[PDB]
Amino acid sequence: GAMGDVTKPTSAKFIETGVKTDGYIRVNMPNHPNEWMISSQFKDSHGNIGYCMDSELPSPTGSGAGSLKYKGAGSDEFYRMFKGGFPSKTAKELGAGNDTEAWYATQLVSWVLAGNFKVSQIVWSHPNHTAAETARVKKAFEKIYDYAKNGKDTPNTEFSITASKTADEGKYHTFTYKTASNKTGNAKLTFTSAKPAGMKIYDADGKEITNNTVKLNSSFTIKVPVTTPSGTLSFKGTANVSTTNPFTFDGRGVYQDAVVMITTSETKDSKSLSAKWTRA
C-alpha cells in the first residue's frame, strides 16, 4: 500500500461571523469551579467554519491576530468532528434546537478533543439558559463526540489502477486498465522499466494520450506493437487529487489555536502493474 503526500497549507486568516454565546454549559476547571466557556463563531477567509482548540485564549480574529501560520494536520477525530458536526450536519439532524446550539455543541467537542478538559468536568447547566436548551446541546454533543471518537471515516484518498482485459488488435498487443478514486483529479503514469519502441496510450474514448496523463474513474489502454520482442513492461500511476482535510493553525500563545477544513492537493501512488506479451 502506498502513502499519500498531502500538500500542507502555510497560513489561514479568520473572520468573526457575528454569532456569539456565553455558553450552554460550564466546566469545573482545576482552580475554578463552574467556569464559563464563552465563544465567538468564526470562519476562515474561504468561508469554512473554524473551531477553537484552546478554551482560555481569545478568538483568532481582528488586526492583532492577522494570519495564523500552519501548525499541523488534524487527526481523524477532528476530521469526523467536522463531517458529523455543524454545519455539515443541520441542527435538526444533530438534535440541536437552532444553529447556535449546533455550532456550540460542535465547539464543545473541539475543546474536549484538544484536551482542554475531560467530559467528567462538564457542568450541564448555565444560569442564562434553560435546562431544555442545555439538554439539546448535550444530546448534540454526545452524537458528535461519539462519532468523532468511535466513527470509522477518515480523509483517506483511495486510488487504484486495475487491469481489466488484454487483446491483440490490428498491429498491437493491447492492455486495458481501470482507474478508480474517491477524490477528483487525474493520474500520471511512470514507467519503471524500458518502454518498447512505438508504444502508445489511449483514453476510454479511443483517443491517444501523449502527456502520460489519465482520468480517474475511467479507463485507458496501452498498446505495444506486435513486432516487439517477447517481454514485459512495468508501470505505476501517481494520482493528483483535490482533498479537504482538517488543519491546525498557530495562535502564538496569544490567540487560540484553531482547526479548519482546507481544500488542498494530495499525490498518491497506485500499485505496480505489468503488461506481458509474446511475439508471434
Author numbering: 1 to 34, 35A, 36 to 184, 185A, 186 to 280
Task: Quote the paper.
An increasing number of surface‐associated proteins identified in Gram‐positive bacteria are characterized by intramolecular cross‐links in structurally conserved thioester, isopeptide, and ester domains (TIE proteins). TEDs are predicted at the distal end of a large number of surface proteins from Gram‐positive bacteria, and the name TIE (thioester, isopeptide, ester) proteins have been introduced for this family. Internal thioester bonds, formed between Cys and Gln side‐chains and first identified in the second thioester domain (TED) of the Streptococcus pyogenes minor pilin Cpa,3 play a negligible role in protein stability, but are suggested to mediate covalent bacterial adhesion. Structures of Bacillus anthracis, vancomycin‐resistant Staphylococcus aureus, and vancomycin‐resistant Enterococcus faecium TEDs show a head domain with Class I topology extended by a β‐sandwich; the latter contributes the thioester bond‐forming Gln via a β‐hairpin insertion into the head domain.
The B. anthracis BaTIE and the 86 kDa E. faecium EfmTIE86 proteins are predicted to comprise a Class II TED as well as three and five CnaB‐type isopeptide domains (IPDs), respectively. EfmTIE86 was identified in genomes of vancomycin‐resistant Enterococcus faecium clinical isolates. SaTIE‐TED (Gln254‐Gly502) and EfmTIE86‐TED (Asp39‐Ala314) were determined by ESI‐MS to be 17 Da lighter than predicted (suggesting the presence of a thioester bond), and readily yielded high‐quality crystals. SaTIE‐TED and EfmTIE86‐TED crystal structures were determined using Se‐SAD phasing and standard refinement procedures. Continuous electron density between Cys and Gln side‐chains either previously shown or predicted to form thioesters (SaTIE‐TED: Cys296 + Gln467,5 EfmTIE86‐TED: Cys88 + Gln292) confirmed the presence of these bonds. Despite pairwise identities of 18–23%, all three Class II TEDs in this study display very similar tertiary structures. With exception of EfmTIE86‐TED Trp146, side‐chains of these residues hydrogen‐bond with the thioester‐forming Cys backbone.
